[PDB]
Amino acid sequence: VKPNYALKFTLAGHTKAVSSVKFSPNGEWLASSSADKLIKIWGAYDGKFEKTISGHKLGISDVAWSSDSNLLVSASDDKTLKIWDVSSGKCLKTLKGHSNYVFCCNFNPQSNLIVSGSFDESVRIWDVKTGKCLKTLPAHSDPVSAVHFNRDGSLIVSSSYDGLCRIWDTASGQCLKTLIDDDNPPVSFVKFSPNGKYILAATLDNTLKLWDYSKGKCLKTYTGHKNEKYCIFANFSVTGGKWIVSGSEDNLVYIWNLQTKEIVQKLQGHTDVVISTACHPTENIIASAALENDKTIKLWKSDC
């Protein structure tokens, strides 16, 4: 069994490299962030451009949706995060306290909290309603490349160039687990599986690994793509077949069988590093986005 993702739309409008794309939880929208200091909102099913959201003083590396699809949070090199009302495009809050670029962000499922990771090597937990910093975790000794909540929001996973993956108790901020692996290659991305039992971690040696973090065992490895220099997003695709989806520095989208680890599809068409991919919450739809030579977002559709 293999998927047959085919290109349906190419979305243009960012004036610099795209950094991150994310589908809204209700499936209606795709949000994109860019080095051009902008967030853009597109219709998830027809690719129609909906609006531009601005206000950051420097580029944006990541963006994330609240559970009710009404809010966005963005992480910027201007050292702040911003919470945005999607319908009005207004900046509801500016979250200050990081001392270097903010690289990654995520709402918890409740969406009363935001987690952020920064080049200042820290992980911060913020109150959505007030915008105050609730906790600062000295999470790492190198820039933090990814942060993600589990499906109940009780845990946070973070990754860093220091080579570590760390699991944190959200309520207390205490580190529950540290994953070390061999010769400590930089960890460029990490996220929980939808069931919350496994973590997918990308390392800058052209490798993805699926880990059981409680036991500390790597259960799967996925290779064949190129990832040595960029923090590329990866995903579990669960709407049809159970795939692993990632971008690559060879300008392709890679799709593996989660269980067998075999490459089941390579999506051709981007003209620069595919820095970001995202999987639609209900349909077999992939969004991909690429760097300076390309600056576009592509939407792809599969029968399984």
Partner: peptide, 4 residues
């Protein structure tokens, strides 16, 4: 920037 992630883009760099």
């Amino acid at each position: 920037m992630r883009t760099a």
